[PDB]
Symmetry: none
Subunit: 718 residues, 2 copies
């Protein structure tokens, strides 16, 4: 029990200790983000779960020129502090330059890798005035890092940004070939020095090649000629091993894994090394020695498989698993939480998000509600529906609006209104039994209609059976009914199947959807109402979980089906029902996430590029901020229910046309084995729908009216 | 038809005011209702329409301080005789200047004006127009302001009150330097009342305070000199009941309340003595001699002389069968569409039956049923172990063991607003260290959540309606003892009896009770589990929801039921209770609950170290929620504590205690376990706001006094 242990993790916040001489010494709070390259640190992030318990993320950070003793000393402190916190903390091994996204999210003024350490006699605490003559190099995109560099022109290159810190004057230098997002972020390194390190009393001078002030030319000399500046299919696969010098044995050859494969007596390693991270899962009932040696366990597994030493390592206690970990498993369920608030773990970057329940009356006032439910509006706007025959849009009979045949593909042009600026959504619905010359036609025609309308409408491709929530809400109160095949083109109408089964599901908004499924018992579920119609009789089955909205939709389907139903509760019904299904087997009844879906699958922001033919994606750590949407990039906003494609105005055109495909490749490569039919929603810069903007607390509508870099330089210049 | 004015009296719902001039009744002009000459006496007839369609009469007569005994006696004579013209169905009130009843004050809360003069000095209400005016009013008090005419001089002024110097076409309101800013707010509709009613709109209102008096003011009053300074609760518990004979003598019948309703026989007249609280009631039996019934007012006067109560004591005379709710609450379990009496300040309230579908659209429905929402929002339940919140097993959500205390954090949505409720449930067998821990932990989490959540402390057995509705359709199950702690599990009782009661919303609650026949009730379903078998009893009154809840309780108890209607039951059912005795068969108030116990709003303070409460008369209005006060809203089923933003910290910390002490002192002998619900200004729940017709959500966005002064400054 260290004295620093007693101050650790008492209240939500961030705490940083430096390991100095086998002791924990606090880093001054205003310097959080500065890390000496020669040192090791311990970092405790305390989040307040909505259930009332506190959640602990324990990181230790190893600089590149770290000594072996203090590298080991940090590990000892994390192991011993996890114990002071009764083994409920999630532990992280972080090394300089390769830190986890979680760790990086704590500091979005960037981090600074300072030269020196305890061995060379350097501290964070500094006298009131101290002569400064440092230089920093700033590279990367999602989370910027400034590395202390030798004060010389040999450190410079055309393409990066540089901060030469002269004390009361901070000189930010932007290379000639630095594109303009990098200068913007390099400026919050400049201000961090001014505000945090100099208590405000300093000025920031920005310059580029050929406009260096004499103060800069005095220290570095005459400027010479500077030189130039200076992969996704890996993430799909992962294996699960069991831990017992200790050895390992494989348990699952490929993901998704069975949640039952983790037993509480042992420790497991989930190997995701080709993507740069390995997990260690501490069973509730493992040897005290195995749980205390989990970090050395991970170290030995990294040597054994010849993974890079910089590989990220996370250790998770049973019952405190992270959402990224649980997504490796098929249908993870925490036996606790369908009741209570939240789940075992609350991702730090959405811990501030206040949860808004859906209320149709006031939805038009809350972008938060629109995003948190995927509902741009209440669904009552004007709309036109086309069925695609051959290569043409053919208008659908307005009386049949809401009915969709699986042998067709459709286009919906919808006019939404929410808040202060109106917009349009183009839905491309592709039935599972539409001929793929027509599906492909529906795609092209969708893009054609987007550019006819000036290129501003949202485009969202949906596959039959995985319709987004806002799409079901477009038909007054009537349910969205989706037949498994056939066509509504005037030509060949067909004779309905002998015995058909429909599944009637509802969304946060009370709207309903009726999907045909093969008439078999293994396709039922207690969360929904169903409708089975035979030549004999007409059933309406109702699940234990099905509520009042599920049945209102279900009959109105009977009303369209030319029927009177037999109302039938779950488990207690005539034995004529299950003969109509050709027997009986198991069907899954575990309830749906609903309000906790955001807890189990927080939205994540990625950048993506198709350069040199390799797809590659970069997660953007920390809170979702509009500032991270680089106007020359195509971004991915994954909200689990759908993947948003944000295309910047100034992005390359080959990336713009491939926006749909890029998202499809993100889904195909997700280690969670995502549903291939997951809707993809392309979104243009400056015309983002509410269901996208709402995820960015502090979104400003005029953000791009003034160029972002030019505005930032106004704050420093005046 | 004693009088020509009698024929116009009480024909239509409204208010009627006559001044007693020369042993005659002459109408006060309607636009001047509220002005009263100190030298006169008035008769005031309030006519409200009962919910069945009949008219009910409240007859007041008002005695000014400078009233003559003859014209005061004439008012009393008229009150007795107009009660007679209305066939003796009226409740009569004796009101004296400055000490009027809350009922009387509710008629005028643009304030009252106590004018100088009277009939004897030849002054009338009707006056020629554009007439010279030079009057001065001192405006003190708080709940219902009173502006008394004072001499036009600086010697009438003081540091702390408000004053209106009425100059005719110019009305000057002066606010003393140390006048708190709610009283200035109140003086402001004293000022406009003169402007709108007395000056036909054509007049201007100039507000000023110490050191900014206009020259018009300094011309009339002179140079302003140095002004001087400005200028309980346990009484209401006890009351005694006497019987009246004839010269009058009295004899005691009930030493302390609650009284037996049967103690009043229809042959005699009774006096309920509550003089230490300032009121006495006299009760006229249906079949007493007219001679005693016509002298009820003189009887009350002489009884007040005998006990040396102050002359200003309020007097109400009640006819049998027409008693007021405040009167009936002195008796244990009073039994008579609507009821005998409808309190005036809720006669306009339209009653909303509960419909879950549109509850989110009607705050009125939320208040009238104690349901902030349908109960389906997200919630977290904690059990208190030692000094910690421990989350409950989600499988047992809805079950509560009486040997523990719990905290429930509930997220409600209603209309377009969000809110939170923290329920503190304290089991009857929880140890007092754990009870107290749950209390402290409750307050701790309220401040963790920014101080905005509603806090509601609940005692086992008196659960509010909205708490029972939180578990889908499953009933809130309440065991008599034991704990759900992962540590010591316990062995359930040999034979257990549950009482299954339902709410306005169909939600149910299953409360364990002693296995005795005298603990049954015809309105509810019951569940008896013995070692042998499990009965499910059903009452004459028990409905669909009562056994649906009762059934699923059997599902939790792992037992199969034998359905048993009341009066038609096996011997094993009555063996399992150890015999047979009488129990409760009187049906519940339900929709008439608001009629018998209308909501009432009080202000309370702990200043001087004594407790004090002041009732706020009239219609419940947001304006009466003084931002520097702690208010109590008693809805009988629950007591709301409304905490003003700008109240002292000693009062905020004692908000829970203040409500407990209000309950302890109620003469009705309220259930000590009555739920208390603390509520913060600007974060009021729908079940509170719904009682306030005209509630504005942005009312405090602009300061109330600043907004009021803009209306007069126009």
């Amino acid at each position: 029990e260290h004295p620093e242990f007693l101050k650790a993790g008492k209240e939500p916040g961030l705490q940083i200790w430096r390991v100095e001489k086998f002791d924990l010494v606090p880093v001054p709070t205003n310097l959080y983000g500065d890390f000496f390259t020669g040192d090791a640190y311990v970092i405790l992030k305390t989040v307040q779960l909505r259930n009332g318990n506190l959640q602990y993320d324990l990181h230790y950070w190893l600089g590149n020129e770290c000594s072996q003793d203090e590298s080991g000393a940090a590990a000892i402190f994390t192991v011993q502090l996890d114990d002071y916190l009764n083994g409920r903390a999630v532990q992280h091994r972080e090394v300089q330059g390769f830190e986890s996204a979680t760790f990086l999210g704590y500091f979005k003024s960037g981090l600074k890798y300072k030269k020196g350490g305890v061995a060379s006699g350097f501290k964070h605490v500094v006298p009131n005035e101290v002569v400064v003559q440092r230089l920093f190099q700033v590279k990367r995109r999602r989370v910027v890092r400034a590395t202390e560099v030798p004060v010389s022109w040999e450190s410079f290159n055309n393409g990066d940004c540089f901060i030469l810190d002269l004390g009361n004057n901070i000189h930010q230098w932007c290379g000639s070939n630095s594109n303009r997002y990098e200068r913007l972020k390099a400026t919050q390194v400049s201000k961090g020095i001014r505000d945090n390190e100099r208590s405000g009393r300093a000025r920031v001078h920005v310059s580029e090649e050929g406009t260096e002030p004499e103060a800069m030319l005095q220290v570095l000399g005459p400027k010479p000629a500077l030189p130039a500046g200076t992969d996704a299919a890996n993430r799909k696969l992962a294996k699960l091993y069991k831990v017992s010098t200790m050895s390992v044995s494989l348990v699952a050859d490929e993901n998704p894994f069975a949640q039952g494969a983790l037993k509480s007596e042992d420790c497991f390693i989930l190997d995701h090394g080709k993507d740069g991270k390995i997990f260690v899962w501490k069973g509730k009932q493992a040897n005290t020695e195995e749980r205390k040696a989990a970090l050395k366990t991970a170290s030995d597994f990294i040597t054994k498989m010849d993974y890079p030493k910089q590989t990220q390592v996370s250790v998770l206690p049973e019952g405190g698993e992270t959402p990224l970990f649980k997504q490796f498993f098929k249908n993870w369920r925490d036996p606790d939480q369908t009741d209570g608030l939240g789940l075992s773990y609350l991702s730090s970057h959405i811990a501030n998000v206040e949860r808004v329940p859906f209320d149709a009356a006031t939805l038009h006032t809350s972008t938060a509600m629109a995003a948190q439910h995927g509902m741009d509006d209440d669904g009552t706007g004007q709309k036109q529906i086309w069925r695609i025959e051959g290569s043409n849009k053919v208008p659908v009979d307005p009386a049949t609006y809401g009915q969709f045949y699986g042998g067709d593909s459709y286009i919906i042009l919808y006019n939404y209104r929410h808040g202060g600026r109106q917009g349009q959504i183009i839905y491309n619905w592709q039935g599972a039994q539409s001929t793929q010359d027509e599906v492909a036609a529906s795609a092209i025609l969708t893009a054609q209609l987007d550019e006819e309308l000036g290129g501003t409408p949202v485009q969202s491709r949906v596959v039959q059976g995985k319709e987004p929530a806002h799409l079901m809400s477009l038909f007054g109160g009537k349910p969205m009914i989706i037949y498994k095949g056939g066509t509504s083109r005037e030509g060949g109408q067909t004779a309905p199947a002998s015995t058909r089964l429909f599944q009637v599901r509802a969304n946060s908004a009370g709207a309903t959807r009726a999907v045909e499924v093969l008439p078999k018992a293994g396709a039922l579920n207690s969360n929904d109402a169903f409708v089975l119609k035979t030549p004999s009789a007409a059933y309406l089955w109702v699940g234990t979980g099905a509520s009042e909205a599920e049945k209102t939709g279900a009959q109105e389907l009977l009303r369209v089906l030319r029927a009177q139903p037999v109302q039938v509760a779950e488990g207690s019904e005539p034995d004529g029902f299950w003969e109509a299904l050709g027997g009986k087997a198991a069907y899954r009844t575990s309830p749906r996430l609903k309000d906790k879906k955001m807890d189990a699958h927080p939205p994540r922001l990625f950048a993506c590029s198709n350069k040199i033919g390799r797809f590659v994606i970069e997660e953007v750590p920390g809170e979702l901020m509009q500032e991270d949407l680089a106007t020359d990039d195509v971004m991915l906003l994954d909200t689990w229910d759908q993947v948003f494609v944000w295309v910047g105005k100034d992005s390359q055109e080959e990336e713009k046309t491939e926006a749909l495909t890029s998202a499809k490749r993100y889904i195909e490569t997700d280690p969670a084995n995502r549903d291939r039919r997951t809707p993809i929603t392309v979104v243009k810069q400056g015309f983002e729908p509410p269901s996208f903007v709402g995820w960015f607390l502090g979104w400003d509508d005029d953000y791009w009216s003034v160029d972002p870099l030019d505005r930032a330089m106004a704050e420093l210049a005046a």
